[PDB]
């Protein structure tokens, strides 16, 4: 057996185990929100003693 083969032979399924791990990520989303204050109206009031 060659030294390179022995190095490959040294690694074993029980000897080396590979596991793939990922972190859950929420999908990116784009949303547009517009806010506009309540409508305002002009009011004119005249008060007199008789009224």
């Amino acid at each position: 057996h060659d030294e390179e083969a022995i190095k490959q032979t040294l690694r074993n399924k029980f000897n080396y185990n590979t596991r793939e791990c990922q972190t859950i990520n929420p999908s990116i989303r784009e949303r547009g929100v517009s806010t506009e204050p309540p409508p305002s109206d002009t009011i004119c009031g005249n008060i007199t003693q008789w009224e």
Binding site: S40, T42, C44, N46, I47
Partner: protein
Amino acid sequence: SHLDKVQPVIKNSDMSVEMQKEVEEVAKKAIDYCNTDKEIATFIKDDFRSRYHGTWHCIVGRNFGSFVTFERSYYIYLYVGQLAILLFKTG
């Protein structure tokens, strides 16, 4: 000679002198132009709104008491005859 006769006097003024001078001419013009006091209030608000953008509240009466929340340096108080021309811009 009526303009000389009215002699409008500003008891309390909180505005630039150049702007204040313009208000006196508008106040004198508004009184002659408007047949009634109610018309005078509408005319003053419309002229100021066109001249300066914003929300203007104007109340003119023979006898009244007023406490208001107006933008600083946007409140001018002037009294001509028995009419008080008061404008206070609120943001």
